[model samples]
Target: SNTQTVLPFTGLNTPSGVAVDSAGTVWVTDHGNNRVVKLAAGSNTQTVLPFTGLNTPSGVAVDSAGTVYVTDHGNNRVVKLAAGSNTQTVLPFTGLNTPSGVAVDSAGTVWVTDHGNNRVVKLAAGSNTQTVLPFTGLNTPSGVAVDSAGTVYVTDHGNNRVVKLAAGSNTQTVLPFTGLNTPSGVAVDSAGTVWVTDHGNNRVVKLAAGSNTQTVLPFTGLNTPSGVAVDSAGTVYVTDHGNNRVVKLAA
Candidate 1:
């Protein structure tokens, strides 16, 4: 029937960001608790990662290689735990101001939403330096994502719009969708379909690839939904911020 299932509550305190790895493990950034946690593929049990004393962890992304990346929001830094390591190493991007979102493309290039700075930035696979993307004068850009084609999508929070920059173009286009209010988290699935957490509207919206219009997803009881991710199998997961739980929708 395509109805959703609210995962069993597992101490998710103000969950902000959510991600699922290739193996089906779900990872979430527990913002209020200042930690990160994971639920295995077929289990409801939550396992807390060993990243210590994190200050308001915000966004999370898991690369194909199973490396986990998270935005330490209050600390203004991004850190990652490699596939097999229990320890996390902070990426050396300097002068970050409240980085609230992160995404890693297939090429391993990292994209981040410098929330406080009102801009988006990227670090090439092996480069330690960060370069700002060309979408200038952005106001409070919060969530960011990169698809297989290298197109980047972001939620311009203060502007109350979602915009995308093509693989190499300096120009960006705000999706034609209207009536959005403080849109935040964003994700682009394998088929190029875009999904957004319409924060202020308390709903989720979808724009099919190459489409001019958007449709609101069939979700109810969402209160200020924040982060969203779609797995390879097309399963949709959203962090219901105000409700304090994660919701799963079948493809």
Candidate 2:
């Protein structure tokens, strides 16, 4: 990474999470500041401070149309910032507790990990109803993701493994693993590859699409990393919480 760039907004407080969109814009969740910031592609310090009224926002995600979703953990709500505007609406849903992670399916249904509630819920597109995964065994699920096949993957922090839930079943398939250590963030690339942030281990790993085999990738100089994301083109981004910086790996 000879061209690795260190964004110099050095005064940011606890840059807790990172997510990218189609246009390569970066969405950052500043937990310490109780806000989320959006950085335009190729731009560093100068960016949009779209919405900041968050209650312990832990994760931020952007949908296909640019709609921003934030997990208001302290408030037990998920707020959607409509694309191209400043309209923010607290998605009215049920069965939520200290929600921490979020993602959007291809159909725009937002998914959230109810960390305290020990389950994941899907916010159907164009609706506020929540479909909570009633199946048990999720211990402090921290991160969540959905693949092209519509399967849901959750980083079960308490169990120290990732579980895959098929589209409509309650049964869980724990993703084969050998090197997971208190994993937190989870992301799926277009190639169906599963990427995770092994927080306790201070490293990142990539699980190839359609297989259980995993390969640990170098996460040099990271400090208590909290969140990890990947762009459609395979560029990887990791949030080093202890250092208060985000690291990007070129595709």
Candidate 3:
């Protein structure tokens, strides 16, 4: 923990979601400020992009092309800002109920957790249609993440477990063991390992892909660690929500 880097930027307004693109720019949604801030890799200057569709934004994810999608929790819709555009485009399809967590697959399909509806849905890449997952034991899912192979990894806070649905199936497979306590964020590393923020437990754990085995990293002394993301080089970034700081850890 002492070797980690503490971002110089601070005083953020309820910063909840965090993501990194191929370019290394760090993006975050300031829920309390109702806007997203883009900080270039290793730069202190930030560019604030305000959108009309953002109201209590909870999660932010991006596609390979660098386009960004954000979960507008207060509006129950996903807002998109295509690469090179500052305007917001609300996806057309709508069958959401207070969606909270969101992610984009390699094919650009947007994945969202219908928090109040008790399900995770995927929006077809081009048509923007909804495909609600038919699974059980999902309790107020909070975060969603997808790997290169399209497998869905979700954090079900209500169920006190992480749910993984294989690509193109409705069956729910709980990640073995019960180390997470009210987990809030989930992500996958370049090696296909599942890294999750055990908020209620004050730590993050990495699960061996497709297995019950887990590796809880040396990341300790966290307070309500919420959102997580992995970069191209496999480095991990966690949102220290309770401390109002973002800490970066080595791969």
Candidate 4:
């Protein structure tokens, strides 16, 4: 069946972020519940992570080695859990102001959008130093995703658009689609097609590789869809924020 599946979640309160790891396991930040959770590839059960007191965790990203990174929005910090370890540590970068979306590259470099500061920052795999991206005039930047080629895509929430920073470049360009109302989440698939959740529009929009046209996915009845993620196989997952659950769309 190619129908949309609203993944089951018992006590999943206002899920705000979602990511799929290399193993096909799905992870989401249970924002209202103050926790992160995971659902195995073929299992319907959801397991809450061990992170304690995550105040309104908003974004989650899984690295190549299965390590999980989360942006604790209310706490104004980014935290991570190594693969197979329950010991969580806050990343050493400080002076964050309401960090929202986060992403990790193949090389383990971490990217975060400091929402309140109106800028994006990155922490290299082995370095504790945080470097701000060159983009200026960003307003409430929310979700972030890095492509296979290292290009970083982010949702300019306050601007109602999406912008990208090419790999190894300091310049930023806005994608050409229009009519985005507070676009909040973004993801790029292996084939370079970008997926975004138009938060105010209540739908997901797709920008294929090398195309400027935007296609809205056929998801109806979505209530304030907030976060979007595409798995290795091109399957799309989105957090229905207002409805308090995550939905799965076939590849």
lDDT of all the models against the reference?
0.89, 0.81, 0.81, 0.88
Residue 145 shift from truth in candidate 1, angstroms: 0.5
Each prediction's TM-score versus the true structure: 0.97, 0.93, 0.93, 0.97
- TM-score for candidate 2, residues paired by index: 0.93
Query: What does the lDDT come to for candidate 4?
Result: 0.88
TM-score of 3: 0.93
Q: RMSD in angstroms, candidate 2?
A: 1.9
TM-score of 4: 0.97
Positional deviation of residue 31's Cα in model 1 after best superposition, in angstroms:
0.4
lDDT of 3 by residue, 175-251 (tens): 88456799999988656788899989888888876677777767766888888888978778888877777777876
lDDT tens digits by residue: candidate 4, 7-125: 87778888899998767788999999899989988887889888876899999998877788999999999998887877798887678999999998878899998999999999997
> Candidate 4: where is the Cα deviation over 4 Å?
none
User: What C-alpha root-mean-square deviation, in Å, does candidate 4 show against the real structure?
Assistant: 1.2
